[PDB]
Amino acid sequence: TRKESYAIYVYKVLKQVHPDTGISSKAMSIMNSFVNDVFERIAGEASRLAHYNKRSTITSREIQTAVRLLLPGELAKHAVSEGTKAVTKYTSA
Amino acid sequence: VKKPHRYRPGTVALREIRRYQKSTELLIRKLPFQRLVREIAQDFKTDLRFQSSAVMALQEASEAYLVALFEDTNLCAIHAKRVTIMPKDIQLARRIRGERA
Amino acid sequence: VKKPHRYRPGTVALREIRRYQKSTELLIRKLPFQRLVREIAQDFKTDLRFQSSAVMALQEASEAYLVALFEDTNLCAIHAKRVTIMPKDIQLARRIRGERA
Amino acid sequence: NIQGITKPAIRRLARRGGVKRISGLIYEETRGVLKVFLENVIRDAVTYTEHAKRKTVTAMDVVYALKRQGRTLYGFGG
Amino acid sequence: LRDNIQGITKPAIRRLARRGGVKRISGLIYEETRGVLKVFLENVIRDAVTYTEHAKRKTVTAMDVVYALKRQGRTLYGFGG
DNA sequence: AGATCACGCGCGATATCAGAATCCCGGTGCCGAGGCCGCTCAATTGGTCGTAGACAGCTCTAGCACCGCTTAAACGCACGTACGCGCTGTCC
Numbered sequence A: 001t002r003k004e005s006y007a008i009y010v011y012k013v014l015k016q017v018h019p020d021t022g023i024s025s026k027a028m029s030i031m032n033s034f035v036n037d038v039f040e041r042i043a044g045e046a047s048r049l050a051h052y053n054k055r056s057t058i059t060s061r062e063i064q065t066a067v068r069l070l071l072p073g074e075l076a077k078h079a080v081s082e083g084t085k086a087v088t089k090y091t092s093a
Numbered sequence B, C: 001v002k003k004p005h006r007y008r009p010g011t012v013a014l015r016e017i018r019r020y021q022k023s024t025e026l027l028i029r030k031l032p033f034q035r036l037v038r039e040i041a042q043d044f045k046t047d048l049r050f051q052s053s054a055v056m057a058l059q060e061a062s063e064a065y066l067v068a069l070f071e072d073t074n075l076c077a078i079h080a081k082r083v084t085i086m087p088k089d090i091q092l093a094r095r096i097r098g099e100r101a
Numbered sequence D: 001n002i003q004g005i006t007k008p009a010i011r012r013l014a015r016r017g018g019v020k021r022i023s024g025l026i027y028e029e030t031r032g033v034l035k036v037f038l039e040n041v042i043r044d045a046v047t048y049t050e051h052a053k054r055k056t057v058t059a060m061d062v063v064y065a066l067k068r069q070g071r072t073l074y075g076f077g078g
Numbered sequence E: 001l002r003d004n005i006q007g008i009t010k011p012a013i014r015r016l017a018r019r020g021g022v023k024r025i026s027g028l029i030y031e032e033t034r035g036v037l038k039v040f041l042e043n044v045i046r047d048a049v050t051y052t053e054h055a056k057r058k059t060v061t062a063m064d065v066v067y068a069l070k071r072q073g074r075t076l077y078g079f080g081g
Numbered sequence F: 001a002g003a004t005c006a007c008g009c010g011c012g013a014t015a016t017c018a019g020a021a022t023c024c025c026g027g028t029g030c031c032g033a034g035g036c037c038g039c040t041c042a043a044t045t046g047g048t049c050g051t052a053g054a055c056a057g058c059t060c061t062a063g064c065a066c067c068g069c070t071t072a073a074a075c076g077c078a079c080g081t082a083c084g085c086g087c088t089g090t091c092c
Helices: A007-017 A025-052 A060-070 A073-092 B011-022 B030-044 B052-079 B087-097 C011-022 C030-041 C052-079 C087-097 D007-016 D026-051 D059-068 E010-019 E029-054 E062-072
Strands: none
Touching: A007 A025, A025 A060, A025 D026, A025 D059, A060 A073, A060 D026, B011 D007, B030 B052, B030 D026, B052 B087, B052 C052, B052 C087, B052 D007, B052 D026, B052 D059, B087 C052, B087 C087, B087 D026, C011 E010, C030 C052, C030 E029, C052 C087, C052 E010, C052 E029, C052 E062, C087 E029, D007 D026, D026 D059, E010 E029, E029 E062
16 A cells, blocks of 8 residues: 655755765654654644634644744744745745 | 850751742742843843733743752752752753753 | 783773764663563553564663663762762652652 | 842742752852743743734733643643 | 563663763662663553554554654654654 | 982883774675656646635723832841861772
8 A cells, every 4th residue: 555755855855965865764764754743743833823813724824933933043043934935936836 | 145046057948948838929029020021022022012910920930940940959969968059950950851951 | 920901990881881872773682672561561451462663662762761861860970979870860860850759 | 130030039939949058159040040941931922922913922822832841831721 | 471671681781871871880770770661661561552452453563652652752763653 | 517419219201012992994795775667546727615814993901101108128248157078098
């Protein structure tokens, strides 16, 4: 059957960061688990934010606030910049 | 001739421990702590207003955290065969708690 | 008339510290830990099966927890002006962490 | 302003914590620790209030901020 | 299965301490460490078996252990999840 | 009796005689990773309808602010005692 994962996307990111660097299967699994964990954290915080504000929808604003809460200082700043730039690119296209 | 009733050092300390573990009122004066909270907040956002209950909640959480920290600090000092808490005791308590790196 | 080459006490300990902080392989033997896991699980449900991956995950989690606990224990032992970790050190580490009451 | 956390106030907090004897330098260390804790909690609270588009920090924002850090607080409409 | 906690030998605890940066280990440390390990394993396997029972399975899967650790606040990477 | 020189003893540093453990260099076989292929399921495109959220107006509650008293509490100062800290020796 089909077991979905983030293997291919993490590999694309890796080859875009270190084109001559591979990743082992165990490291692949660890990275996939990390992506799932951060997804759960951000999504749960966004859900809590929506619930607190009596709001029924998770918008990009909720995800941004969840990122600002979850991540530390510099990581939060850079992640927010990346997210806003990606959303702007998406809206333009 | 005359002599004051000075309690042996460490006795009034025990009396104060008993008095303050038996009570529940907040031990930091309200107004200075409120001013401190406002000053810390003004770094993050300007022209902020605070609900009185918000500052009270901050004070309760802060005092509870400090009391627990001092409990762990006292345990650390006693572990070192001492009776006085010293900054290294707080540092070890925070490091073991996972608070300070 | 020759004497063997005995390293001074504390030298091989440091060499072992370096070796085991450099490596990553599990330090507890696998079969004894698996037997322990099954014995502990026998008190919650009988005739249980364990995926080899499940036992490996338990071993990794336990070893990581014990290594972190020993780091905290060493910190407390040094805090007491000692070099040897003693059970009181583990107890203090657990008490400050919040694990032990 | 951080000095508004007076020496006697830290003495009282230590006493309620069961501390008998307090070193001279414990007060500055405690002021620093309290400042760090308040910085974290108030940063999270202000994040919550900004996300709600409010200029007032409500007790609920503080309660949520504390709950975030694993310091759940009861008695303020949790 | 009887007396398997002693399977966590003295040298194994020594190795774990060394990885923790410990230079000198008291003799009494080994029994205390065995007790601590037993408590930790009891706390984890309890939740793992709870998850297994809820799924109506006779086999404890690695994902049950991962869920238990995540519940206790010890998220583990490298075994799924 | 004091100063200088020579010899002996004690301490520090380097070398060394060794030998021990680690790291490194090379060859080797492996299996784990990267890649290509085929199939299909999940994501994309297009369209609808409905309600969730955005926005404007109004209300009034609560926050801010200010003043003035009073008085609890902080601050300051001093004496001293007992606790921290260093040094030392013994035993395990």
